[PDB]
Amino acid sequence: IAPGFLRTSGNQILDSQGKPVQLTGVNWFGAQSSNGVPDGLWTRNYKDMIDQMAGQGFNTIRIPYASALLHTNAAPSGINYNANPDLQGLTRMQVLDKIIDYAGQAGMRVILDHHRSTEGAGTSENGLWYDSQYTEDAWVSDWQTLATRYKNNPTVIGFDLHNEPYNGTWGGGGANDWARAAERAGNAALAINPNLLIIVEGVGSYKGDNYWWGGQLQGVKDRPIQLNVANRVVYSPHDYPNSVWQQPWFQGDNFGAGLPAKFRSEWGYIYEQNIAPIYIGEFGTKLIDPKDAVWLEALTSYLSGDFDNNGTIGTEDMSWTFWSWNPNSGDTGGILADDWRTINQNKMVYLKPIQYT
Ligand SMILES: [Br-]
Numbered sequence: 001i002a003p004g005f006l007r008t009s010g011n012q013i014l015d016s017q018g019k020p021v022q023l024t025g026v027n028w029f030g031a032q033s034s035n036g037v038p039d040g041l042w043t044r045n046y047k048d049m050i051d052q053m054a055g056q057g058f059n060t061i062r063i064p065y066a067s068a069l070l071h072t073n074a075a076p077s078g079i080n081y082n083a084n085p086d087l088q089g090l091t092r093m094q095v096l097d098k099i100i101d102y103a104g105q106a107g108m109r110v111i112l113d114h115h116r117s118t119e120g121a122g123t124s125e126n127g128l129w130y131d132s133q134y135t136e137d138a139w140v141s142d143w144q145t146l147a148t149r150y151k152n153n154p155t156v157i158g159f160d161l162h163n164e165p166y167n168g169t170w171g172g173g174g175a176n177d178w179a180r181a182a183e184r185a186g187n188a189a190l191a192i193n194p195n196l197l198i199i200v201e202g203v204g205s206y207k208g209d210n211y212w213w214g215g216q217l218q219g220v221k222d223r224p225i226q227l228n229v230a231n232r233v234v235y236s237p238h239d240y241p242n243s244v245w246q247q248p249w250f251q252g253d254n255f256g257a258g259l260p261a262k263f264r265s266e267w268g269y270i271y272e273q274n275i276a277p278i279y280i281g282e283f284g285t286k287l288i289d290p291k292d293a294v295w296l297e298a299l300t301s302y303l304s305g306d307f308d309n310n311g312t313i314g315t316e317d318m319s320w321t322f323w324s325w326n327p328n329s330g331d332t333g334g335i336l337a338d339d340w341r342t343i344n345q346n347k348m349v350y351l352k353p354i355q356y357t
């Protein structure tokens with residue numbers, strides 16, 4: 001991708017020369033945990049991992065973090081400093097700086113994702129972007145601190161304002177209105193860096209329709225995100241297979257035939273109607289449950305622009321980051337095997353045709 005920040009135009013993400021580009025990467029989680037740094041540095045070197053990502057055709061790293069990362073003085077834990085000698089004596093944020101810096105040198109971009117408030121493993125137990133101790137005020141101010149820190153670094157292209165706010169609502173104006181909260185944090189971040197992409201995930205349910213956490217983007221049609229800087233909003237659904245949860249739209253034979261219409265109903269319509277870009281922030285599978293393959297086959301085809309999954313498709317297709325680069329995800333696994341080095345080729349076969357080239 002051409003150097004400099006990005007922008008949106010219709011359902012397209014454009015580089016600094018007006019050319020449509022595509023973000024096709026992986027999730028590298030860990031910085032939201034108690035260690036305060038992305039996982040795997042207890043056995044791998046951080047430059048070797050980024051090079052391996054780029055060598056597999058990926059160009060984007062979604063990096064989850066926790067609010068607690070921005071206020072802790074604890075040193076990072078777990079890093080093997082024999083294998084990562086350049087990270088010796090660095091703070092948790094300084095290790096993030098090192099990772100972002102090298103990723104830009106390797107031709108990759110970075111999306112920061114507020115995964116949770118406290119240090120933990122996955123999605124916030126609250127289903128919200130705040131709790132009784134980590135306020136929405138501090139969440140907004142923390143996004144301003146991050147925007148300031150990477151204001152002059154176009155490697156950091158976008159802010160994923162919050163991971164899966166499945167207990168928020170799309171509208172209503174109250175304290176749990178995720179659309180209001182996202183517009184508040186988006187404008188606060190854009191006031192410091194107006195060149196950031198503002199990545200807004202969906203909720204969990206909307207007018208009685210329940211979908212994957214983060215993948216319920218049905219509210220955009222009647223109440224879209226409106227920020228004080230134009231051409232910055234990217235919508236980010238999450239989608240997963242039967243092995244993660246036995247959803248009703250996976251049940252019964254011929255379920256795969258109705259998956260394209262299901263993708264379009266919850267979030268895909270935003271791209272098809274040229275409303276805004278679509279960047280699915282999470283999706284993964286171990287490819288053991290046979291229904292998982294039917295889902296991934298339909299999903300990858302839909303993301304490519306084959307909205308009816310028949311075979312027919314100067315714009316780019318939908319952007320995406322796979323869950324995960326890490327192997328240590330219990331339900332989905334990742335791109336790397338448990339040894340944190342071996343590539344799972346059976347997943348790469350699905351991903352390579354929809355990577356940005
Ligand atoms: Br090193």
Ligand SMILES: [Br-]
Nearest residue numbers: 033034119120
């Ligand atoms: Br933890």
